[PDB]
Design a protein around this ligand. Structure first.
Ligand SMILES: OC[C@H]1O[C@@](CO)(O[C@H]2O[C@H](CO)[C@@H](O)[C@H](O)[C@H]2O)[C@@H](O)[C@@H]1O
Ligand SMILES: OC[C@H]1O[C@@](CO)(O[C@H]2O[C@H](CO)[C@@H](O)[C@H](O)[C@H]2O)[C@@H](O)[C@@H]1O
Ligand SMILES: [Cl-]
Length: 628
């Protein structure tokens, strides 16, 4: 039954009495020792519930915490300053000053050096937070856009070196920007040293993955598994050349790590420590839902999965307190929120709000959006949503069917409409998206396409610009950390030649992953062009959000607009937000506006607005009203 003091002397064992004296009197040790006393009990409790009486548990922990000391000992002192800051301010994530951006290093800026050169622009745009897409060594050719990781410790050589990454992170900190990076902890590539060695039968790598002699067990699992990339293969398994089968939730070249082995936790915790010491502020925990497998279940959102993530959290509290987790879970809304906790992932993607933003543009009806913002927005203390419009991924229509039923909506019919609308198979749709993973056996389908393509900008729809403005306004103002897909701010369209690369032709997500459009960025300071209007709008909303404390925190209360086309919510009893999702003008009545002040300044238009009479919003207009 190992404890804090026990492991601390196991750690201090390697030192001679001469250095032990200097170590024990040092601040580094004093801090580590305090943090062990505070957080180790949590680590022990979480791992005990997963690994029980496992023989490997004790020695795994002796090794892991020695590594943790050695990692913290080596940790840059600038980062140790950030550790203390974030320990003492858990709510930094909840500040209205936080605005995020995300890009592919190669597609946006060429390489890590070019990314560093682009930092003055992130400053111009107002970012405090930057997510760099998977930047690690991966298979040449097909790699799932870097999501098949061949090494967590090596940069993708097209991008530069680990030293460049260190340099870039340092420059981002100097510029007041947090560095955000993926921790792809559910699976590695099949080319990872661990995968190669486990498959070869190296006993040190026994049970690093899920490997089977035939179809017997994969057949048992497949009957309860959801299909993630049905285009690629059925179920959750792929066959090796020697005849065996390996768990592959995603592509065949992505092998699911086996977390029922305590050594796998150890291995991945060591890689996590390495990334922490790069100065990474937030790790996007990729596919959090899948890290525990259980026969007879969906192998999604299992209690042990939560417990393991909570264990990973404890390790950071002990050895790099500055590092927070970002949950990536595209599941039922009831399951999305369960990853979000101070002792789990402090922030999480908000795919419900995102999906419903696009839903509401299509139907023009705020019913589902209003419902979601009313019952599913508010979070526990010291946690926040990451609010977004578009990402590197396809759009899944992951609203709750039970929730929809109350508004007289049937799941499939609605999703079929949504899928047809956004892929331009519907009468007069403005959207120019392409299908992704149409599953003929179930009817499920997702949508690829850039924000600009989905709103009608490719064919110069006169409402397109306002649509982008409107969607982003909600992400920026509901409460939580808003994330811009970089390129959106100048209206970057689809790369229509995406499938000409034979390594990209089987994954339509590439359509919404275009290179930096030089011409559009050159027009960002010219308000005449679409790029300039979008840039001016988004830049204006960012500036308002970051300097106005009415936007602070993550809580909201919805406001009943009594118009099916207009969304209403209130921030801090002081900011009233109206968003019209109709291409026609829409009215909030005097009667409905009774409780409000007679006049209010609109932060979007810059006008004073009257609320003692009918308020009429132009097509797609957003108002940000100071009511207190
Ligand atoms: O359509 C992608 C599919 O995978 C998810 C799992 O959370 O997305 C993440 O995981 C994949 C494997 O690493 C990546 O391909 C993807 O880029 C990543 O965001 C879900 O978004 C979705 O169900
Ligand atoms: O559709 C063009 C292009 O997209 C891909 C890659 O994702 O397949 C998508 O579209 C197909 C039909 O439009 C669907 O059957 C499939 O499920 C979806 O992924 C390519 O295969 C296709 O060439
Ligand atoms: Cl997911």
């Amino acid at each position: 039954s190992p404890n804090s003091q026990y492991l601390k002397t196991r750690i201090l064992d390697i030192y001679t009495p001469e250095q032990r004296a200097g170590i024990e009197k040092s601040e580094d040790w004093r801090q580590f020792s305090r943090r062990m006393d505070t957080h180790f009990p949590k680590l022990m409790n979480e791992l005990d519930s997963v690994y029980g009486n496992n023989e490997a548990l004790l020695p795994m922990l002796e090794m892991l915490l020695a590594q943790a000391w050695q990692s913290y000992s080596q940790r840059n002192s600038s980062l140790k300053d950030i550790d203390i800051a974030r320990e003492n301010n858990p709510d930094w994530i909840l500040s209205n000053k936080q605005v995020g951006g995300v890009c592919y290093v190669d597609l946006f800026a060429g390489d890590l050096k070019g990314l560093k050169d682009k930092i003055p622009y992130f400053q111009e745009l107002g970012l405090t937070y930057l997510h760099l897409m998977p930047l690690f060594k991966c298979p040449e050719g097909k790699s799932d856009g870097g999501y098949a990781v061949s090494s967590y410790r090596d940069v993708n050589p097209a991008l530069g070196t680990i030293g460049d990454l260190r340099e870039v992170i340092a420059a981002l900190h100097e510029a007041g920007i947090s560095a955000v990076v993926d921790f792809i902890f559910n699976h590695t590539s099949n080319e990872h040293e661990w995968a190669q060695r486990c498959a070869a039968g190296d006993p040190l790598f026994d049970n690093f993955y899920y490997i089977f002699p035939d179809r017997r067990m994969p057949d048992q699992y497949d009957r309860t598994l959801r299909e993630i990339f049905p285009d690629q293969h059925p179920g959750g398994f792929s066959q090796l050349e020697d005849g065996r089968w390996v768990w592959t939730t995603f592509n065949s070249f992505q092998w699911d790590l086996n977390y029922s082995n305590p050594w796998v936790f150890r291995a991945m915790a060591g890689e996590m420590l390495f990334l922490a010491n790069l100065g990474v502020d937030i790790l996007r925990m990729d596919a959090v839902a899948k890290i525990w497998k259980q026969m007879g279940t969906s192998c999604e959102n299992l209690p042990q999965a939560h417990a393991l993530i909570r264990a990973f959290n404890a390790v950071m509290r002990i050895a790099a307190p500055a590092v927070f987790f970002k949950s990536q879970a595209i599941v039922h809304p009831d399951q999305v929120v369960q990853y979000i906790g101070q002792d789990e992932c402090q922030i999480g993607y908000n795919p419900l709000q995102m999906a419903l933003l696009w839903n509401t543009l299509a139907t023009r009806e705020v019913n589902l959006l209003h419902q979601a913002l009313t019952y599913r927005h508010n979070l526990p203390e010291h946690t926040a949503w990451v609010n977004y419009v578009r990402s590197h991924d396809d759009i899944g229509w992951t609203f709750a069917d039970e929730d929809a039923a109350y508004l007289g909506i049937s799941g499939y019919d609605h999703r079929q409409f949504l899928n047809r609308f956004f892929v331009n198979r519907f009468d007069g749709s403005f959207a120019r998206g392409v299908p992704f993973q149409y599953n003929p056996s179930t009817g499920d389908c997702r949508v690829s396409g850039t924000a600009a393509a989905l709103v009608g900008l490719a064919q110069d729809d006169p409402h397109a610009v306002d649509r982008i403005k409107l969607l982003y306004s909600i992400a920026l103002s509901t409460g939580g950390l808003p994330l811009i897909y970089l390129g959106d701010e100048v209206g970057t369209l689809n790369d229509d030649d995406w499938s000409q690369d034979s390594n990209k032709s089987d994954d339509s997500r590439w359509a919404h992953r275009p290179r930096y459009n030089e011409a559009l960025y050159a027009q960002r300071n010219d308000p005449s062009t679409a790029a300039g209007q979008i840039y001016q709008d988004l830049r204006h909303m960012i500036a308002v959000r970051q300097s106005n404390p009415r936007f602070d925190g993550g809580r909201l209360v919805t406001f009943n607009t009594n118009n099916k086309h207009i969304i209403g919510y209130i921030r801090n009893n002081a900011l009233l937000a109206f968003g019209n999702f109709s291409e026609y003008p829409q009215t909030v009545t005097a009667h409905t506006l009774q409780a409000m002040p007679f006049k209010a300044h609109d932060l979007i238009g810059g006008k004073t607005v009257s609320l003692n009479q009918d308020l009429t919003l132009q097509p797609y207009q957003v108002m940000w009203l100071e009511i207190a």
